[PDB]
Amino acid sequence: RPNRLIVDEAINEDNSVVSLSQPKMDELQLFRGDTVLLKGKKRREAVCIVLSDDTCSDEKIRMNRVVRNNLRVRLGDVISIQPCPDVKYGKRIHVLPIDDTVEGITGNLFEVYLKPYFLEAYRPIRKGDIFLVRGGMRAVEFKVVETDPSPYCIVAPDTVIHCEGEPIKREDEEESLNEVGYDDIGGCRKQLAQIKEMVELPLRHPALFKAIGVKPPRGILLYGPPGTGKTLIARAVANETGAFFFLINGPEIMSKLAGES
Amino acid sequence: FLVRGGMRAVEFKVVETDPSPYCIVAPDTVIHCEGEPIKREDEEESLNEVGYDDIGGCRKQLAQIKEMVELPLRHPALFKAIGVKPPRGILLYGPPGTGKTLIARAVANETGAFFFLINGPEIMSKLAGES
Amino acid sequence: DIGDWFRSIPAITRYWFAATVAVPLVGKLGLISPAYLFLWPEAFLYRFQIWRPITATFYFPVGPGTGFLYLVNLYFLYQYSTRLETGAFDGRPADYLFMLLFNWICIVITGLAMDMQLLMIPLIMSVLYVWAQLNRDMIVSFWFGTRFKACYLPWVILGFNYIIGGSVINELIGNLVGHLYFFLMFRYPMDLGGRNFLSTPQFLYRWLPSRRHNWGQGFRLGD
Amino acid sequence: DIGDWFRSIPAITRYWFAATVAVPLVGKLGLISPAYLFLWPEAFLYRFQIWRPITATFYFPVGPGTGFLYLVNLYFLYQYSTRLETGAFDGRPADYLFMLLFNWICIVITGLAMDMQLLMIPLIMSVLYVWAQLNRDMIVSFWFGTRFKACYLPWVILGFNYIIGGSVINELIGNLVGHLYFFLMFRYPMDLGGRNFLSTPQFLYRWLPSRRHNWGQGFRLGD
Ligand SMILES: Nc1ncnc2c1ncn2[C@@H]1O[C@H](COP(=O)(O)OP(=O)(O)O)[C@@H](O)[C@H]1O
Ligand SMILES: Nc1ncnc2c1ncn2[C@@H]1O[C@H](COP(=O)(O)OP(=O)(O)O)[C@@H](O)[C@H]1O
């Protein structure tokens, strides 16, 4: 099927863009400004807009962190690019923040976060999603908790945004967008291309190494001066490939008691 | 019999045949390869563990170990009757990774013995005086 | 702790918990007559006896040879009622008020037909069994237990309570009455028909209303 | 879970489990008369007593003074009956089913010479003694146990049941016949002679087959 592709991270943020090669949209009866439906695991849908890219290949689609999280997918998975340019204008929207991001803020959130975000963008939104707004000093994330008509609606110049209410408690099925990833490391371009080539295969698809019958890696030793970002490479790799990062520390092992260490 | 695969070595078992038991495979014969595989039974040693054909670059040294250990381990009674003293300690030394615990695993698996490895780090760090 | 904690547990739980906890306290000290709360079935068959319609439905003489079993069901109830208010029953207190009444009348009519006296364990496990089938599909593994698979809770709990003690009558009817109501309230309307011909009257809603989403005040101008 | 698992049990064993659980159910709640199954042996001595030849042999009035014993043996029966049916016995269900018949007839006559009425445990431990000895040479160490060496089970299991309870005679009679039958069916033919002069008639194999190998979808591929 000419629908399932591989995903990769983005550069120019823009929570509502995906990059596709020119021939792909040409053979998929697609045109500019056409809203598309993306569907992935757990039967989740995210609505986005498509645009051209200079160096995008046919089988690879570039998209940023926020769109990936909504679909509940990770790097190198497969997605459905099923297109449908038919969305009826929403009438009234209800957007509320997450609890553990608006600690001691208050004020009117509508006119300093949402107002410059939806202004002249015509962002297509879907019920249940999460988006991140770069505030004046923090990064506050919101959650579309109700829409009319449900669930597909595009934000129009004439709607009713009800940003009033108590924040929603953080659920259990999320990635906690305010956490580390591959885009949160700089000055380590070459090294992070070696820890990533020798670790993704044993962790992403484990079953292959059983059938092939070869030896996986069993230890990596990062060395350097303190404060250069070593525990952040291990925390970034665990959060994106999908793993169970379990840290054991130096000092508190050496000082428990006698022979109980 | 052991068949060399694309990346593994799969070993089968002739569990039933007809006419039993000597039946040479002919260009017009029926092969039934379907069914749930048999559990690996006991007694016999697997055809995949180490042997004398699994070492190279040590044709001389494996000749010294073999002549010194083949007699006490194969004919235990003869040394009792003749009453001569046998070897009682062999010390293999060299750089790490050169295959020393593989010379001592091939000798046990071929002459027939009860290779019982004890390790260095695990003995040293059990508990106080209980080690 | 005794003050705020008792008022913070859900009102339904806070009164039901105290309903069957404080009564054994009177029994152990013995001020009122312990013999005054039996619910004699043969007496009900002959005379109405308006003295004890519901009175013997909360009194249990927990003590030397009647403890253990009574004590443990308080633990799960306290550990599990708070969950089943949050098991979609928070928005429907009137519905939760109802099947409690329906279950209480269902166990008591069987409690009067045959001659058991103490209908105390049945009301605990019946709602607990109803909680299982209505909140199935989770994995649970406590510290002193095994790694048993999910959706086994209503049957696995059916064994421990049965084998400790006896009186097969109450365990069987309690689970079965929850089973038939499980099909009636939930499965019967979408199976063949026979919709909710037991709707709670508006008077129950008038006593205690439900929870509804409020939209508030809107604000947005042109562009 | 009750549906598939109950049908998952082999029919002979699934018939066994039902008889061991359904019969207790009737007795405890008081459906049939508890005294209706006693197997009066002196009555058998005088009259034929055709009314209850085998019915009283399944009677077990469980009570809360020895019920813990009733649970461990059934726990032992449940998990080990799986082991013995797949231990060199999958292909010979008829041989196994008939071997139960000798283990039953031997006790019931001994139960007539002496005067014991509770004939449930001795048959259970007899096959357990049989199962251990024909499936010897295996190391077993349960969580609440020690690292005791193999081929010790039939002796140690004779100790645990002896202390808990009593009735020294049933333990003795249970061990001996399984030991003699092991000598009779298995050791006597290869010791001196006297082969199977009790062989399974064809009427059994007509009732149920033993086993048959399967070839599969053949291939004809040469050159
Ligand atoms: N791209 C980066 N490279 C190196 N360090 C970074 C980078 N981005 C942030 N840091 C900072 O480096 C620190 C590394 O964490 P820390 O454990 O304190 O040092 P180390 O990882 O060397 O033990 C983090 O606190 C983080 O703030
Ligand atoms: N002929 C050989 N000589 C040396 N090493 C070998 C040979 N054949 C295999 N090996 C490799 O040597 C490894 C075993 O060596 P090793 O266990 O490290 O011994 P030691 O620990 O004493 O160095 C095996 O994993 C195998 O891959």
- The answer to whether residues A100 and A170 touch, using CB atoms and an 8 Å cutoff, is yes
Angle at C177 between CA C171 and CA C179, to 5 degrees: 100
Inter-chain CB proximity B30 and D218 less than 8 Å: yes
Q: What is the DSSP string of C71-140?
A: HHHHHHHHHHHHHHIIIIITT-HHHHHHHHHHHHHHHHHHHHHS------HHHHHHHHHHHHHHT-----
Chain B window 1-60: which residues touch D at a Cβ cutoff of 8 Å?
Answer: 16, 26-35
Contacting residues of A for C219, CB less than 8 Å apart: 110, 160-161
CA gap C119, C41 in Å, rounded: 12
CA gap C4, C67 in Å, rounded: 28
C-alpha closest to that of C49 among C60, C37, C58, C59: C37
CA gap C69, C76 in Å, rounded: 11
D189 prior amide bond cis, ω within 30: no
CA gap C59, C21 in Å, rounded: 9
Give the orientation angle of helix D168-181 with respect to helix D121-134, to 10 degrees: 40
- The radius of gyration of chain A's CA atoms, rounded to the nearest angstrom, is 22
- Tokens of residue A121, six digits: 């963008």
- Report the residue count for chain A: 261
B2 is in an annotated binding site: no
Q: What is the rounded end-to-end Cα distance, in angstroms, of chain C?
A: 53
CB pairs < 8 Å spanning C and D: 13
Q: Residue A225 belongs to what H/E stretch?
A: none
Starting at the earlier edge strand, list the strands of the sheet with A35-39: A6-8, A60-62, A17-20, A45-52, A35-39
C-alpha closest to that of A41 among A12, A69, A62: A69
Burial class of residue C8 (count of CB atoms within 10 Å of its CB; 0-12, 13-18, 19+): exposed
* Contact residues of ligand 1, CB 6 A cut-off: A 185-187, 226-232
Chain C window 139-198: which residues touch D at a Cβ cutoff of 8 Å?
Answer: 151-152, 155, 163, 165-166, 168-169
Resolution stated for this PDB structure, in Å: 3.5
Which string of b and e fits D58-87 if b means at least 16 CB within 10 Å?
A: ebbebeeeeeeebeebbebbeebbeebbee
Q: How many CA atoms lie within 13 A of D14 on its CB side?
A: 10
B62 Cβ below 6 A of ligand 2? no
- Tokens of residue A199, six digits: 């670790």
CA gap B41, B43 in Å, rounded: 7
Instruction: Pick the residue whose CA is nearest to atom 26 on ligand 1.
Output: A229
B96 Cβ below 6 A of ligand 2? yes
C-alpha closest to that of A126 among A102, A157, A95: A95
- Closest partner CB to B127 (pick from A212, A213, A259): A259
Ligand 1 atom closest to the Cα of residue A224 is 22
DSSP 8-class letter at B45: P
Inter-chain CB proximity C223 and A92 less than 8 Å: no
B91 is in an annotated binding site: no
- Tokens of residue D176, six digits: 């001996």
C-alpha closest to that of A143 among A133, A128, A155: A128
Residue type (1 letter), A224: G
Can you say whether the dihedral through the CA atoms of D132, D134, D140, D143 is positive or negative?
negative
Which string of b and e fits D183-208 if b means at least 16 CB within 10 Å?
A: eeeeebeeeeeeeeeeeeeeebeeee
